[PDB]
Design a protein around this motif. Structure first.
Motif, short mmCIF file in Angstrom:
data_model
loop_
_atom_site.label_atom_id
_atom_site.label_comp_id
_atom_site.label_asym_id
_atom_site.label_seq_id
_atom_site.Cartn_x
_atom_site.Cartn_y
_atom_site.Cartn_z
N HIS A 126 0.83 -1.19 0.00
CA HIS A 126 0.00 0.00 0.00
C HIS A 126 0.88 1.26 0.00
CE1 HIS A 126 -3.42 -2.63 1.85
NE2 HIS A 126 -3.38 -2.74 0.52
N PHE A 127 2.00 1.22 0.72
CA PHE A 127 2.92 2.37 0.80
C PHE A 127 3.61 2.63 -0.55
CE2 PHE A 127 7.40 3.65 1.07
CZ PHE A 127 7.21 4.97 1.42
N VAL A 128 4.15 1.58 -1.13
CA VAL A 128 4.92 1.69 -2.36
C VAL A 128 4.00 2.13 -3.50
CG1 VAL A 128 6.25 0.36 -4.05
CG2 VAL A 128 6.65 0.00 -1.61
N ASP A 129 2.78 1.61 -3.52
CA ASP A 129 1.82 1.92 -4.57
C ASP A 129 1.48 3.41 -4.50
OD1 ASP A 129 -0.67 2.23 -6.08
OD2 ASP A 129 -0.83 0.06 -6.09
N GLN A 130 1.15 3.89 -3.30
CA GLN A 130 0.70 5.27 -3.15
C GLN A 130 1.86 6.23 -3.43
OE1 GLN A 130 -2.61 6.99 -2.14
NE2 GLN A 130 -1.17 8.01 -3.51
N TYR A 131 3.06 5.88 -2.96
CA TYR A 131 4.26 6.69 -3.14
C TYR A 131 4.58 6.81 -4.64
CZ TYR A 131 8.99 8.48 -1.91
OH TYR A 131 10.13 9.22 -1.77
N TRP F 127 -5.32 1.24 3.71
CA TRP F 127 -4.18 1.50 2.80
C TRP F 127 -3.68 2.95 2.94
CZ3 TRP F 127 -8.80 -0.78 1.23
CH2 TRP F 127 -9.76 0.08 0.70
N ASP F 128 -4.60 3.90 3.05
CA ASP F 128 -4.22 5.31 3.23
C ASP F 128 -3.36 5.45 4.49
OD1 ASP F 128 -5.73 6.25 0.94
OD2 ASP F 128 -7.54 6.12 2.20
N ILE F 129 -3.84 4.88 5.60
CA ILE F 129 -3.17 4.91 6.89
C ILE F 129 -1.80 4.23 6.78
CG2 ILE F 129 -3.28 4.08 9.27
CD1 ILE F 129 -5.25 6.46 8.31
N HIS F 130 -1.78 3.04 6.17
CA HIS F 130 -0.53 2.31 5.98
C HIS F 130 0.52 3.21 5.31
CE1 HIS F 130 -3.08 -1.63 5.91
NE2 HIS F 130 -2.76 -1.28 7.16
N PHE F 131 0.12 3.90 4.24
CA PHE F 131 1.02 4.77 3.51
C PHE F 131 1.54 5.88 4.43
CE2 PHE F 131 1.40 8.91 1.43
CZ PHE F 131 2.53 8.69 0.66
N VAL F 132 0.64 6.58 5.09
CA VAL F 132 1.03 7.72 5.93
C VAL F 132 1.95 7.24 7.06
CG1 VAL F 132 0.13 9.39 7.62
CG2 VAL F 132 -1.00 9.15 5.40
N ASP F 133 1.59 6.12 7.68
CA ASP F 133 2.37 5.53 8.78
C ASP F 133 3.81 5.33 8.30
OD1 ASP F 133 3.09 4.31 11.23
OD2 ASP F 133 1.67 2.62 11.02
#
Ligand SMILES: O=C([O-])C(=O)[O-]
Ligand SMILES: O=C([O-])C(=O)[O-]
Ligand SMILES: [Mg+2]
Lengths: 329, 342, 347, 328, 345, 343
Positions: A126-131, F127-133
């Motif tokens: 989720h992090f890599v995708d959004q970034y 997923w939003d939270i995961h990214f920000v975290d």
């Protein structure tokens, strides 16, 4: 859900997707070394996939050099049909933000796949995708960069289904045998190899039949990956000299259903491309089955064929044809 | 996914009560047969007495031009034959195909009261079970079928392997699973054209002292199938062994499946019938330890210990099943009669 | 399934705070004993020093009329003995059985402060753990137990294997798992010639060779899936996977080979049913020297365990450092009562 | 959670078979009594006649030094009294408390074959049910209890409200749920002016209109969400939802308003804390609710038609005006 | 499963639609197809409604099921519905009429049916059955556009499984409340079909002087409608208020419909001719509100920032609130000349 | 979806240890300000003293062409200000926006040690939270941030309402939720332009009297659901903006509804709203007094006591402490409440 799964994560980002090309060998190169970087254009023509390594075996004081090195050679080279990948540093690392940001900004359009070390679960995706999405928007990248998860922990393996379904950017998985063995408490004598003393002792009546350590792990990786429409890959084999064990190990993975393996040295390129191409013996007995039944319907024959064996044959014949553009048989 | 209180309700008004326990009978071999060919049709009453389970086949191995014929074929022979203790199954076409609606319709309309199990090919997930369950329920109601036609899932896709728990739990009609290693190899992209044996190139190369120890392609697949099935009180089955001639290989594969915990295998020709029956017959030590459970607990109540292992209502109910199944096999085999002790 | 914020709370007022980390101690061998037999009970204090873990048995192979003797036997030996470095376990009776209520309540009431792990047979899902967890917690508050009694789950049914993720994550009391291969084999349609081992007829037959008559038959391992699955779930939850018992007490080679297969896949230790098996376990499940030596390099490169380093090409962080401290502390504790290994580990 | 094949099996060898269907009987009022008080224990044979359900209370409003007396008191009345058609319930102490192990153990031992439903305070999630389920089974087997003692979950925390579906499906012993208004409000940080009540200052202020300065203030029901969620979850699992206590004993009118609201939304009954609340509950929670009137009929709505008919006759077998009114 | 979600579930059936069609759906007018007088006037009625829906289920007697089935096929075959959508409510999935209801209708008029309403949906399994069954029929009869599915919520179980029902197929269109059946399933007591109860309310606290306690009535359907909207809109579907049974109480009908509209429902059912105009009025944006919203879109061309308008202060979010109202108003105005005038188009 | 063993680990080497419990401090009023307006920027050191929480705003109500000035403005005034006992929040831009990468990196790089809570708008799922975290942690390690920056999720989308449990459980950074009524109305297609009050034509029509219309609360289901998910996760629920600045009688009523259903505080859009939020969301006196009694009856906080028929234990003691602590810190700057609580 399916409705927002295919929507772009950031405005200006490209529409979400697997592209079809041969991925028999993923060849790793150290971007900081001038000698290797100088010959990238010539080496690229000899491999299916070329992957820049910013992570394992790149010294801390050479992270910035490797990063900049990668960016120079990917900008300047026309890679033709060779896919260009990069393995960035781990998500807990001091180099990962810079890795991803700099590479998208300078060569985002050139990069097909980004390999993420040590994926533990869907949150990492989720992090890599959004970034990537936000960086693709910012630098107007036309084609979204796919995500390849390196499996290096027990948690990751447990979370494999969730990882596979966490983004439409997912491309596949590579086994990271060194780290994954270390995580599990699994003992092996070579990176990406088994162990001589793992076997069954026959009843005294004594022989010792060696067992494969990676059977469960590979079988699992393949089911989860293929059910999501992704590709499984054997990672590296570490004993560069032992070419017979490399072929043995690569071949096991090909048969269980992996698409390719890593090469960590020039001598591993031909083994990988050989092993992850279908054997010409099997392409003949396959073309025998496709000829026996013109279409899926029917029976044939001293082994029973049908629509299913026709599908088995179509896989092996559809692959042997994609590769030759060479064997040419 | 369904709540227990609703799980066991019939999905149609008039349709028969869903079962609680699986019917206990011989299923050591499932004999496939193309119903469109008259030569085999005519021998079915003979073959029927040889096999535990007979299963007609409308799907793969039946050309497009003879599907309709295989359907009518199956109804003709099912009408005419009394199968006795031999179970009657059928394998219909895929749920996406033009033949499946009529396959299931005409068969329940004509011979539903004789059909014991229906086998669904290329099951991807629980939605597949749901459709068939509901479609059967409505057809059983229409033709007033007296006991529920069970669902047997062919395990032929990667998605099916991934979704195996959801499928197992989707319906009380669920009977069990059969490994379809030809399709499952195409679905996975396993690089063999062979239909489910060893493979020479899958093995371990020893260290320099170079010996090559072949490994089993299907260890994970069958282990996973046995666990899920048995957890849901269902039965795992090995499927086809396509090398008909190689009876030495067929025995080994059937025996692998048996030792991992499958109940039976498919037979694609007469030579495989006796092999399947031999391998999949219950272990004598199994049967004799069950009898001891039964004799030590008069009416399955309380608790008793046998060879240092506490026994109870769960172990007693599994004992009565294995003993019951033993008797039923002994009724048409003399060797096993005295072997188990009947 | 419980939320992180509630997971670590005690389930009873006055129950001790649940742990956030397994205690690190040697667990290479789980030595079983019938606490009813007075001759074994006499020798326990001597046997204590020869084993990592001593586990009293109240379940299988203790007769119905022996159950109350074993329950009292175990309470007697545990009150009299000081086990020092040796861990005290107990395998209680099954959760459907007539004895389990009294097994747990008496043992905690009397010697609860001396019991480290409680082994629960035939764990079929998270519900079994929830019962034991809540029961122990209420017994622990009543009798003022000082540290939590951990739960060790025994894998004896197909249902258990299928619910293993849910079992592993059910409670912070969870310690790990043991395979009960006799029961798990029975539960599955599985055929085994010996309790601990597999079957000789499980194998792969070669394609026909034009030359020789004899087609080679390569025996395969029945327990590969089960153990690989057990290790991944356990390690992912911070727990430990253990192989259970090997039945052929005579067959020391087979015992060595099956113990070893488990160790090579990541199991922490095995059961010893007989004094000959004790040294076979300790030998096999000792941490490997390379892993221990490597772990010492990590600790050296990162003194306070902070920042980031790189050793043999590989990034090191707070996770690898903490994990390297676990194996070094475990090697130390093993070297303490084994000078042969003290030299090998280099202490 | 558990699979249908295993869901309905006993959890101990010798423990009675789990029910597949909840028993039909009047549950319009659950009358609570403090079992340590001698005066009240005397009147229980009379009071049993006037109520559908009798519930002994060991938890709230029972002092710390009276817990043993309450535990013994309840047992005394249990084994003495003949309850007839009146169901007997008990509210044990909380699962984290120093009294709950003996509460359950002593009651199941002595008077277990007279207990219909056990009420568990502060059910947080399915784990709480798993414990009680398994513990009752072991006690049931040991004491050869002939039918299962059912579990009735008190909802007193936000977590319990969040975990409500998982709690409902946790066990075939499950009977249903009651609201613990005071404690659920305090867990949520709601503000009520009485236990089981609401708040006069929860309301919607109208817009200013015309030239009339007085803007009308329309009061709102604080519990609408809670009870709507409780009924939907209970009825989907075949369980029953009850309004909890109404602590303002003297305001009989307000009590009627709250009980009636619960009933209109689908609750089966309510608690009575004093004898004035007994008739309010029975009045309010008393009602008969192919192809007739445009709707199709089948196996499912036949069973539910038979449930309401049976309930009506049993209600009638004691209540002659309602026997006369229902036409029996 | 997102890659396998949008695949055709049969070989011959068309590609599962990527999003819903964009037409007004303010009124869903029901009609009994077994009645000749009704079929005769369907072409006239169809020009006055956004949606016309044949009913084969409740209110159709058992004797009339075949006639209603055949009567629907005859109306749909002979009529040109223009911009009007055609629905049908088939019989329940556990019933002796449903196999034939769906089969006959898809074969005969599959290319004219836009949406199939399924009664008494209790879970995603119901949806799986219909999706697969429609897929096979569509293939067999070469149906060009895929028939969408509409779930009636008439049971507690259905309300509990709402998220799973909504996600169960790409054919899913949306939800309707079946409040009679849903009240029965729940054990609710309503005084009218799909209506509140006079005795559901709050009693004010005892006063000093008046000594009559005010009694503030409450809405039985708040939780239900709020939950349906959230779940439906989060899956890209539309929520509908079902039937209002009290045909003669037009004040109550209007008020109930309006409450649904405010909470985010797209339309309601019409059971008689008097309810047609009520549903269209109530589920069309208010004139003033549209105008109040019209100038907000002007005050912020970007849709970004703050802006004072009359006395009020608006931002990015109220602009979005405005775009919704105005987008709907402009759509209705295409076929209502009177509203087009009053909205200012 | 993360296991408890991994849940409280930092996501970046160098990042501060995650919290196990929310800091306790007054949060009765979240005062929003547009940081690009110099005239407001200049008053912030004084306004800071008047409010429990100050929250900079970079998202809605900030014009596209003032976004970079708004970021720089927030940084300027946060750099130069001693906020004392006042919490510093910021609402960054949406995760699908061209300003959010830089919003977060720059704020953390310059003033990350002064920032208590970061509010995320238009949250759709975990997923939003995961990214920000994961993003915050990497910046936190990079800039050597001492305390973890918490995440406040704005509840503005139908997806967010449906995915509320997953969002709430997604990270130990979670602080809580604010109801964003305008965006949630637009997302749901609620047919209002009003920002979070009553609506005159949402109501129940009575039967003929021998015809009254009782207005209903639009937000009962939404607040009841927000409070339950948040408190169960040990988080706090908040009412967001009330847009009608003129109508203070309606604002007080809407805030009190929120308060009576269990919200901690509300946003203030203008200075007249500050005292309203402070007045409404101050702890009720009987709650403080009953909390005082719990701590006195169990001086240790151990064992088991009882008060007014209700068992008290280690959990209820933990809660009574929170209330008293919170009341004590409110008294520290308000003499009138100091009396009422007894300090
Ligand atoms: O299903 C089959 O027949 C197969 O694939 O072997
Ligand atoms: O975006 C917001 O703050 C809102 O919707 O009120
Ligand atoms: Mg097949």
């Amino acid at each position: 859900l399916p409705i927002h799964f295919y929507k772009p994560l950031a405005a200006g980002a490209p529409q979400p997707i697997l592209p079809v090309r041969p991925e028999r060998v993923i060849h790793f190169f150290p971007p900081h070394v001038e000698k290797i970087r100088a010959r990238i254009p010539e080496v690229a023509k000899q491999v299916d996939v070329l992957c820049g390594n910013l992570e394992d075996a790149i010294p801390i004081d050479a992270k910035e050099a490797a990063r900049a090195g990668f960016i120079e050679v990917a900008r300047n080279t026309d890679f033709g049909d060779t896919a260009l990948w990069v393995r960035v540093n781990a998500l807990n690392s001091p180099w990962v933000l810079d890795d991803i940001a700099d590479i998208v900004a300078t060569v985002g359009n050139k990069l097909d796949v980004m390999m993420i070390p040590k994926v533990e679960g869907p949150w990492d995706i989720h992090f890599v995708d959004q970034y990537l999405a936000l960086l693709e928007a910012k630098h107007q990248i036309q084609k979204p960069i796919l995500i390849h998860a390196l499996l290096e922990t027990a948690q990751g393996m447990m979370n494999l289904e969730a990882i596979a379904g966490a983004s439409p950017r997912m491309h596949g998985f590579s086994l990271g045998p060194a780290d994954l063995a270390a995580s599990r408490g699994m003992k092996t004598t070579r990176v990406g190899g088994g162990h001589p003393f793992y076997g069954v002792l026959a009843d005294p009546q004594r022989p010792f039949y060696q067992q494969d350590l990676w059977h469960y792990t590979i079988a699992r990786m393949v089911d989860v990956a293929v059910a999501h429409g992704l590709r499984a890959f054997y990672g590296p084999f570490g004993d560069i000299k032992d070419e017979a064990a490399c072929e043995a190990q690569f071949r096991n993975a090909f048969l269980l259903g992996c698409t390719g393996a890593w090469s960590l040295a020039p001598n591993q390129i031909p083994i990988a491309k050989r092993v992850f191409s279908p054997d010409v013996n099997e392409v003949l007995f396959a073309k025998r089955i496709l000829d026996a039944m013109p279409d899926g319907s029917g029976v044939a024959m001293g082994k029973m064929q049908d629509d299913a064996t026709w599908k088995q044959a179509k896989v092996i014949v559809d692959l042997a044809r994609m590769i030759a553009k060479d064997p040419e048989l």
